[PDB]
Design an enzyme around this catalytic site. Sequence first.
Site, mmCIF file in Angstrom:
data_model
loop_
_atom_site.group_PDB
_atom_site.id
_atom_site.type_symbol
_atom_site.label_atom_id
_atom_site.label_comp_id
_atom_site.label_asym_id
_atom_site.label_seq_id
_atom_site.Cartn_x
_atom_site.Cartn_y
_atom_site.Cartn_z
ATOM 1 N N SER A 1 1.153 0.309 26.568
ATOM 2 C CA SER A 1 1.634 0.085 27.922
ATOM 3 C C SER A 1 0.485 0.142 28.917
ATOM 4 O O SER A 1 -0.484 0.873 28.740
ATOM 5 C CB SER A 1 2.685 1.146 28.270
ATOM 6 O OG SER A 1 3.076 1.076 29.627
ATOM 7 N N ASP B 1 16.630 1.503 12.921
ATOM 8 C CA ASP B 1 15.533 2.392 13.295
ATOM 9 C C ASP B 1 14.205 1.652 13.173
ATOM 10 O O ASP B 1 13.650 1.548 12.078
ATOM 11 C CB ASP B 1 15.534 3.628 12.401
ATOM 12 C CG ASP B 1 14.419 4.606 12.751
ATOM 13 O OD1 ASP B 1 13.802 4.441 13.825
ATOM 14 O OD2 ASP B 1 14.169 5.528 11.941
#
Length: 330
Positions: free
Chosen positions: A199, A35
């Site tokens: 992004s 994770d």
Amino acid sequence: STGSATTTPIDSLDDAYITPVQIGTPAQTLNLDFDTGSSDLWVFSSETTASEVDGQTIYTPSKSTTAKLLSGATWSISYGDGSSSSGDVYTDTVSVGGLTVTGQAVESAKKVSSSFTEDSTIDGLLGLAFSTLNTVSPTQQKTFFDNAKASLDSPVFTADLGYHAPGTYNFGFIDTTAYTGSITYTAVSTKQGFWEWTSTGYAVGSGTFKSTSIDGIADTGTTLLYLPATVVSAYWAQVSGAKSSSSVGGYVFPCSATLPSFTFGVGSARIVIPGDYIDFGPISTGSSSCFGGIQSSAGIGINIFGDVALKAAFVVFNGATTPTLGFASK
């Protein structure tokens, strides 16, 4: 040193991925959910409330000659899906894919919430976010990666998740045969303890690319891709019959649909998520309404590049003094 371990979807939907981990002496192998969105290595154990164990493999520290109780240490964690666990702490030897750390904090669960009990395939979590998020008190503990970093050939790990197929976590090296083209690196902020990056924009299907900054986290521990409501609406508007359902808890679409791809920007580069990766199947057995793999982050407080996004790429988690993230097509 290096390590290399195969990671395997827990079910036919890729709801999560499990990777075998050796703990203790002699080794006890547990299948953990790696994770990158959390920083605790915790396991079902001989101390877990018996009624909360249903098929998981447990760590029994009393059978490990290298286990030592970390006196006074406790832990308690809550995840974005509302699940939780807590307990006490041992140090022990932990190996992943041939890479061994001695003295790793292994957080032994005394209590787990229902969703953990109900998932017999996940024996615990191995956190790979930054150690500043680790919940152990009163002495915070380091992640497996942080403990191994100095010994690694290169201070990196990579995630290569498969679509409906196994993939690989590598530690300490970049497998140049595992991706196509070049790896594009992008800046990381560690201020929230996550692998947080920006992004450069998105496209829906064959549509034109929209240049827009989208701050989010690379989170192998989250199944889906969670993005701003504007982006998600633009995606689902291209799917006839798709709608946001408050009763189901997100966007659903007719199971008869063919989904468009979704592209996200990494600097000047582009990662294409095929439409099929965004299909999470019937909302309930036999339903013709299917659950979408791209969902709004509006209720989260952060955008999450979860497995749906990450499994379309070869992803480098670069733990150099200034961390960065790398993405390549594959």
